[PDB]
Amino acid sequence: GSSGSSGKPPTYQVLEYGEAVAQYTFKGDLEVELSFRKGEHICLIRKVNENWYEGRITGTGRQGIFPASYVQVSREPRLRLCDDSGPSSG
What we know:
CATH superfamily: SH3 Domains
Radius of gyration: 15 Å
Largest sheet: 3 strands, antiparallel
Order of helices and strands: EEEEE
Strand content: 25-35%
CATH topology: SH3 type barrels
Distance between the termini: 31 Å
Structural class: mainly beta
Shape: flat
């Protein structure tokens, strides 16, 4: 809630989305190749694979995939890929 007007209710759902931190400054010109600055927080939408991670750079617009080794994975997303048998109790 930054501005006065607001449709969606004030809540924290992002928790679902993935979380990563740029460790190394990447560089790309092609669409698929998304650029980011170290420290920036890329919002993982649909993780492509354990190698390349898809996201977006809120504020600028850029969007695409990028090498993991470059970024830091802390909270992997969830698009209902597989169903593990009792992964964790909680």
